[PDB]
Design a protein around this ligand. Structure first.
Ligand SMILES: [Zn+2]
Lengths: 49, 257, 105
């Protein structure tokens, strides 16, 4: 996570050319963040179990 | 008791063609061999072109078929046509009556020929929905009335598996990995039922052991293992497996969110 | 003179049974089942039983009926986590202790 942060810095600063293929993958990393049938209590019931 | 074994390349070619035809249903043919009354093995598949009408009897193309047959002969793939795949995207796995008539057109070729329904869309990264079965949600269509279900398994050669291993390289990611939960439901259940089972065995050893000497007891029990050690033993796997199981989720929730 | 002390205990039992067998009862009826003279007598006796950790109820005064506390769902929440946790720890130091007095071999 460090790595990506200061990289993105180098994108807005070092002016390393925009690499779309990476940005796409970052987005795809966000699309997978669990929103958190709610999964929340779906998890709570387990941990109890 | 009857079953089919579906080789990997079959299954992947299957799901590929199905996912590719969405949102229209695709059909093809299944190449394999009948081991006994209780088995059908499917090693191969090839894909059947679209028709103006839906998947149906004439959708099967003789010219195309044999034209594929011989060209597989030259590759040594010679097999019977043991069944025919199909897809009912979004509708789950069942045969419409129109699916049925065609299935009959594959009965009179071979009495053991089977139908395979694949369902591309709701088959997802979790459980894959797949079905295979032959004639006489789904009960609306007479799951048991006009036809009946079968079972499915997957043949895997050693080398096959070994290729599949290197797909995911988990060497870095391990430790944030959570193994399949349902499986640890059978785990955390069957474990407990078992602990119950050997509880009263430890009970019988404490009562009998009470009124009977150790020298006499050894003669009896040396065959099996010290049911107190199945308590001491079996309690663990539940303990630590459940503690890593808890902690792993406690970390994935707060860290990953 | 030991036995004649039981008049307390007997009544405690009376209350506990009247509690387990009823969710909520008008004071009138408890006073009938326990034969006592007055309701005013009752809520002294039952108010006493509650403090002793017997009934786990509350009392509706203006309608004068005991209501016994429920289990109120909550399983889907984290309370079972806390509870199980306390029970767990209190199982540990049992294990501990039984290994500290174990030292002797
Ligand atoms: Zn169909």
């Amino acid at each position: 996570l460090k790595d990506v942060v200061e990289y993105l810095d180098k994108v807005i600063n070092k002016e390393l050319p925009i690499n779309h293929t990476i940005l796409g993958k970052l987005q795809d990393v966000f699309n997978l963040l669990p929103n958190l049938n709610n999964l929340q209590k779906a998890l709570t019931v387990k941990t109890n179990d | 008791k009857e079953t089919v074994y579906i080789s990997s390349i079959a299954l992947l070619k299957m799901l590929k063609h199905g996912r590719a035809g969405v949102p229209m249903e695709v059909m093809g043919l299944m190449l394999g061999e009948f081991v006994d009354d209780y088995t059908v093995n499917v090693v191969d598949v090839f894909a059947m072109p679209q028709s103006g009408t839906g998947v149906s009897v004439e959708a099967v193309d003789d010219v195309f078929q044999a034209k594929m047959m011989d060209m597989l002969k030259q590759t040594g793939r010679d097999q019977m046509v043991v069944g025919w795949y199909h897809s009912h995207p979004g509708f789950g796995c069942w045969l419409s009556s129109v699916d049925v008539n065609t299935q009959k057109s594959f009965e009179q070729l071979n009495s053991r020929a089977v139908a395979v329904v694949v369902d591309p869309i709701q088959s997802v990264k979790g459980k894959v929905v797949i079905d295979a079965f032959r004639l006489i949600q789904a009960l609306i269509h007479g799951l048991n009335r006009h036809y009946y279900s079968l079972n499915i398994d997957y043949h895997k050669t050693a080398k096959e598996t070994k290729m599949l291993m290197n797909l995911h390289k988990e060497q870095w990611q391990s430790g944030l990995k959570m193994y399949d939960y349902e499986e640890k439901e059978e785990s955390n259940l069957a474990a407990t039922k078992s602990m119950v089972k050997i509880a009263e065995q430890y009970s019988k050893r404490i009562e009998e052991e009470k009124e009977l000497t150790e020298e006499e007891l050894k003669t009896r029990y040396v065959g099996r293992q010290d049911p107190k050690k199945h308590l001491s033993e079996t309690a663990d796997e539940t303990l630590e497996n459940n503690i890593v199981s808890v902690l792993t989720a406690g970390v994935n929730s707060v860290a990953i969110k | 003179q030991l036995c004649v002390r039981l008049r307390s205990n007997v009544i405690k039992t009376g209350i506990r049974i009247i509690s387990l067998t009823y969710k909520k009862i008008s004071l009138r009826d408890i006073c009938l089942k326990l034969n006592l003279d007055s309701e005013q007598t009752v809520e002294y006796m039952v108010s006493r039983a509650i403090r002793d950790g017997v009934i786990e109820a509350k009392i509706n005064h203006e309608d004068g009926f005991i209501e016994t506390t429920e289990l109120l769902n909550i399983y889907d929440s984290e309370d079972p986590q806390q509870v199980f946790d306390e029970r767990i720890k209190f199982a540990n130091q049992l294990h501990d202790e039984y290994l500290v007095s174990m030292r002797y071999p």
